[PDB]
Design a protein around this nucleic acid. Structure first.
Length: 88
DNA sequence: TGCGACGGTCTGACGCTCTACACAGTGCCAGGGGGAGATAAACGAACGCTGAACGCTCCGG
C-alpha cells in the first residue's frame, strides 16, 4: 500500500496486485485484532469497578491495542502479548 | 384462526411538617509545548525647575 501510494507510474496489473496484497494485509490487521480481543478483555476486567464501565474500558483498551499493532515488529523475537500489555 | 395461558410490561400504591445524613478494596517516568509569574529597557508624556517678566500698590526720599 505504500508503493501504490507513491505517484510513480507502474503497471496497472502490478497496482492491482499491490492492492490485493494491501487487502490481505488489512485482513491480517483484523485477524490479529480479533485474536487479541480476549487479552484486552482480560486486562480491562483487571481495571474494572472504579467508576468507569466495563465495556468502555474494553473499547479504550482496544484503541490501545490497535496502537500496539501499529507499533509492533517481528524483528524482535518476542510474543505479541508481552508487548501489547504495556499499551493496554 | 380460535383458544387460554404464558408472559412481559406498566402503572400507582391519601396528605402535610416536627423531624432531615451520610456515603468505603489493585503502575511509572521521560521528553516536549504554553503560560503563569519576574526582569530591565523603551518611546512618549507631563511633570518640575529655571526665576524671568508684567503689573500692581506701595512707603517714600
Amino acid at each position: 500500500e505504500d508503493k501504490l501510494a507513491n505517484s510513480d507510474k507502474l503497471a496497472p496489473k502490478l497496482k492491482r496486485e499491490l492492492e490485493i496484497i494491501a487487502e490481505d494485509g488489512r485482513r491480517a490487521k483484523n485477524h490479529l485484532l480479533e485474536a487479541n480481543l480476549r487479552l484486552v478483555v482480560s486486562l480491562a476486567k483487571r481495571y474494572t469497578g472504579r467508576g468507569m464501565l466495563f465495556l468502555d474500558l474494553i473499547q479504550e483498551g482496544n484503541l490501545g491495542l490497535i496502537r500496539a499493532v501499529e507499533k509492533f515488529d517481528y524483528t524482535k523475537g518476542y510474543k505479541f502479548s508481552t508487548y501489547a500489555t504495556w499499551w493496554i
